Homo-oligomer: A and B are copies of this chain.
């Protein structure tokens, strides 16, 4: 109800990172979620005030 039917702001609820979406899949006696998330990359230092 939270991951699929909208976007989630709870940390580490729908995947690891900033959540984007989720896709459900059926499974025998269970369910599988395919969470699509967003992760940063190469960074750089700067001087801030």
Contact = CB atoms under 8 A, between A and B. Distances in A.
Contact of A5 (B1, B9, B11): B11
Nearest to A11: B6
Interface of A is mostly: loop
Interface in A1-49: 1-2, 5-6, 9-12
Contacts of A10: 2
A37 to B, nearest CB: 14
9 contacts: A1-B11, A1-B12, A2-B10, A2-B11, A2-B12, A5-B11, A5-B12, A6-B11, A9-B9
Given A1-B11, A2-B12, A5-B11, 6 more contacts: A1-B12, A2-B10, A2-B11, A5-B12, A6-B11, A9-B9
